[PDB]
């Protein structure tokens, strides 16, 4: 029930409501041993929004991603578009001719050797069960 | 480090894309589940 | 016994054989009773109360002379005496900004892993009071989202003495990855985007970027160079070793296990 | 037993080819260009589109295994 409210305010843009609940239910949060969320959760309040947009829009302007995030202005837009790539959020690149943020699509997972990399562990796993079976069988 | 540098100026756990996907028709499909094999 | 306690205490400390005499005082400190458990005779911690204070000013001597490997040597021995194994520790007032000196030493050197493992030990000390820790964690709450040179707009709030030696490293550790990110997909910008937004309309900051980095301002632009590759592939380099896996597959499957 | 046959035919053919190069053999318009046509085939295995023949077909046979 306190953990109930904690995750809904991430998706919504209201933070004073989040700071209300943290002030309301901090004693349960401090009983859980999760003191250090708030020093790094306000981080992810605007990171959840920018990944949701970058997953939505394939080629987004800087001049539009701000005003949707109640962020007032096309500079406060790419005040969230230079560590998220460094943190591993979005593939997208930015040209200083248009200021537009466009990402691409992954196709070569079956076209290039992704599957047989993953299979070699699982081939080796299934033969171990056959080896654990026969070695542990004939005790009568 | 590196200010992202700029010039210009309830409780719906993917049960929300379930529940905001869900608001005007089926409540007489909650025990309306069984009346259909003499006519139809 | 209390060798030159407050001789060159406040005004200056130009003396160089004082430090060996101060180390000569520190010869006595580790040789009175002990240091490692410091179990009995609580009065033998009372010079260790002042053995904290003489290394505090020894760290103030190291920040006077800009000695980074000593400043961690003092602070670790202090913190392990703030973690004396008999932790009774009567409260000295110079602890809370000394850790703030440690917390700003460590934040400016990309020790963000060392940051968030430091805060585990002081739950209400670091937040509810202690502006010398409240300011570097409000720095870090600024250092989450988009406030890293808004930090420089909040530069003029130092509660202690100047703190210049580690906001200069904070000047250093920001402006160089600034230069690293403009080498990346931020392709090219004119001189005035380096002026208003980096900061500081033109000092020898233009000498900073033209000499530490390239980016020579020619005709009205900072110019990027080639930062691409060729991407070759063979995919039959594995054809020697993928055959090694297939021979191994029929190896164990045929052997009498 | 296959590739042993491959190595056996190459040690024989260079023994013929070292003799006809220098000193003594008839250099005739037999094999020396009919064997030149053997070099003409020599598929260029690791090139542009053949990579998409091993990564679209070997991983088919990996799933069945």
- What residues have CB less than 8 Å from C10, skipping those under 6 apart? none
End-to-end CA distance of chain C: 77
Instruction: Please give the C-alpha separations between residue C215 and each of B3, C13, C171, in angstroms, as whole numbers.
Output: 20, 43, 20
Measured CA distances, A41 to A9, A19, A26, A48 (Å): 11, 11, 14, 10
Chains B and A touch each other (3 or more Cβ pairs < 8 A):
yes
Query: Which residue has 């010039």 as its token pair?
Result: B7
Contact A110 D59 (CB under 8 A): yes
Tell me if C115 sits within 8 A of C106, measured CB to CB: yes
Measured CA to CA, the distance from residue C247 to residue A8 in angstroms comes to: 54
* D46 burial level (CB within 10 Å; 0-12, 13-18, 19+): middle
And the tokens for C59?
């760290």
Q: Phi, psi at residue C247, to the nearest 5°?
A: -65, -35
Please state, in angstroms and rounded to a whole number, the distance separating the CA atoms of residues A42 and A10: 9
User: What is the C-alpha to C-alpha distance for residues C167 and C171, in angstroms, rounded to an integer?
Assistant: 6
Separation in Å, CA of C55 to nearest CA in chain A: 31
Residues of C in contact with B3 (CB under 8 A): 146-151, 174
Length of chain C: 257
Q: Phi, psi at residue C105, to the nearest 5°? A: -60, -45
Q: C112 — phi, psi (to 5°)? A: -75, -25
Q: Which ranges of chain C would DSSP assign to H, the alpha helix?
A: 17-29, 46-65, 68-79, 95-107, 112-118, 131-142, 150-153, 164-183, 193-196, 205-212, 238-254
Residue C11 DSSP code: S
From the list C18, C19, C26, C12, the residue with the least C-alpha distance to C64 is C12
Q: Do A123 and D65 touch (CB under 8 A)?
A: yes
- A84, A50 contact by CB (below 8 A): yes
Q: CA C210 → CA B3, C157, C180, C207, C214, distances in Å?
A: 21, 31, 14, 5, 5
**Closest approach of chain A CAs to the CA of C46, in angstroms?**
34
Helix (H, G, I), strand (E, B) or coil at A110: helix
Method for this entry? cryo-EM
- Cβ neighbours of residue A70 closer than 8 Å, sequence gap 6 or more: A13
Encoded tokens for C230: 């060729």
d(CA C7, CA C11): 9
Q: What is the DSSP letter of C43?
A: G
Q: Does A8 touch chain B (CB under 8 A)?
A: yes
Does A118 contact C at CB distance below 8 Å? no
**Inter-chain CB proximity B2 and C147 less than 8 Å:** no
CA C122 remoteness from chain centre: 19
CA distances from D58 to A110, A117, C236, C241 (A): 11, 12, 13, 15
Question: Which are the contacts of C49, defined by CB distance < 8 A and separation ≥ 6?
Answer: C90, C92
**What 8-state DSSP symbol labels residue C40?**
S
Contact C70, C85 (CB under 8 A): no
Q: How many residues does chain B have?
A: 40
Inter-residue contact C46 to C53 (CB < 8 Å): no
d(CA A87, CA C145): 12
Nearest in space to C77 (alpha carbons), one of C106, C104, C52: C52
Asked if C38 and C84 touch (Cβ cutoff 8 Å), the reply is: yes
Map residue C192 onto helix, strand or coil: coil
Question: How many residues does this entry show for chain D?
Answer: 65
Long-range contacts of A25-31 (CB under 8 A, 24+ apart): A28/A2, A29/A2, A30/C123
Interface of A with C in 51-90 (CB under 8 A): 76, 79-80, 82
Mutate to test the interface with B, among C178, C179, C199 (most CBs of B within 10 A): C178
CA A2 – CA A22 distance, rounded (Å) = 9
* Resolution (Å units): 3.3
Q: Considering only alpha carbons, which residue of chain C is nearest residue D58?
A: C242
Rg, C-alpha atoms of chain D: 19
DSSP A97: T
Please count the residues of chain A: 140
Taking Cα atoms as reference points, which of C159, C184, C172, C39 lies closest to residue C100? C159
Helix (H) or strand (E) holding A94: strand A93-94
* Sheet containing A93-94, strands listed edge to edge, beginning at the edge strand earlier in sequence: A59-61, A100-102, A93-94
D3 touches chain C (CB under 8 A): no
Q: Are D29 and C218 in contact (CB under 8 A)?
A: no
Which residues contact residue C85 at a Cβ distance below 8 angstroms, ignoring those fewer than 6 apart?
C36, C37, C38, C39
Q: How many CA atoms lie within 13 A of C206 on its CB side?
A: 15
Distance between CA C199 and CA B5 in Å, rounded?
A: 11
3-state DSSP helix/strand/coil % of chain D, to nearest 5: 55, 0, 45
Q: Per the structure block, which two tokens stand in for D36?
A: 């030149």
Tokens of D12: 């024989």
Closest approach of chain B CAs to the CA of C57, in angstroms?
Answer: 30
């Amino acid at each position: 029930m306190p953990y109930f409210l904690l995750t809904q305010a991430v998706r919504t843009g209201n933070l004073a409501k989040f700071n209300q609940v943290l002030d309301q239910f901090g004693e349960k949060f401090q009983a859980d041993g999760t003191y250090t969320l708030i020093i790094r959760l306000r981080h992810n309040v605007i990171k959840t929004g920018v990944r949701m947009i970058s997953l939505s829009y394939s080629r987004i302007s800087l001049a539009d991603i701000a005003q949707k995030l109640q962020l007032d202005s096309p500079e406060d837009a790419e005040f969230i578009v230079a560590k998220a790539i460094r943190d591993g959020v979005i593939e997208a690149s930015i040209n200083h001719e248009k200021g537009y943020v466009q990402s691409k699509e992954m196709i070569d997972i079956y076209s290039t050797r992704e599957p047989q990399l993953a299979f070699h562990q699982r081939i080796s796993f299934c033969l171990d069960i056959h080896n654990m079976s026969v070695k542990a069988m004939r005790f009568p | 480090m590196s200010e992202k540098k700029q010039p210009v100026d309830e409780d719906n756990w993917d049960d929300d894309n379930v529940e905001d996907d869900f608001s005007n028709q089926l409540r007489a499909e909650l025990e309306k589940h069984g009346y259909k094999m003499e006519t139809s | 016994m209390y060798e030159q306690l407050k001789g060159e205490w406040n005004r200056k400390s130009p003396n160089l054989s004082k430090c060996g005499e101060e180390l000569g005082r520190l010869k006595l400190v580790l040789l009175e009773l002990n240091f490692l458990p410091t179990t009995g005779t609580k009065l033998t911690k009372q010079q260790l109360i002042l053995a904290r204070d003489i290394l505090e000013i020894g760290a103030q001597w190291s920040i006077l002379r800009k000695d980074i490997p000593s400043f961690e040597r003092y602070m670790a021995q202090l913190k392990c005496y703030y973690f004396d194994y008999k932790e009774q520790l009567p409260e000295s007032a110079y602890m809370h900004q000394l850790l703030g000196l440690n917390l700003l030493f460590l934040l400016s050197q990309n020790r963000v892993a060392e940051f968030h493992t430091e805060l585990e030990r002081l739950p209400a000390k670091d937040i509810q009071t202690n502006v010398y820790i409240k300011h570097p964690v409000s720095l870090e709450q600024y250092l989450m989202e988009g406030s890293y040179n808004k930090v420089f707009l909040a530069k003029g709030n130092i509660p202690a003495e100047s703190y210049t030696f580690f906001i200069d490293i904070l000047l250093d550790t920001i402006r160089d990855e600034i230069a690293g990110c403009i080498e990346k997909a931020y392709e090219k910008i004119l001189f005035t985007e380096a002026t208003r937004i980096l900061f500081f309309n033109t000092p020898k900051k233009m000498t900073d970027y033209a000499k530490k980095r390239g980016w020579v301002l020619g005709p009205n632009n900072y110019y990027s160079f080639a930062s691409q590759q060729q991407k070759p592939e063979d995919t039959t380099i594995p054809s020697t070793e993928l055959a090694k896996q297939v021979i191994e597959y029929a190896r164990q499957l045929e052997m009498i296990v | 037993h296959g590739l042993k046959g491959l190595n056996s035919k190459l040690l024989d053919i260079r023994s013929y080819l070292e003799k006809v190069a220098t000193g003594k053999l008839p250099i005739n318009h037999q094999i020396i260009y009919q064997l030149q046509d053997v070099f003409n085939l020599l598929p260029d295995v690791s090139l542009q589109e053949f990579v998409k023949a091993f990564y679209l077909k070997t991983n088919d046979q990996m799933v069945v295994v």
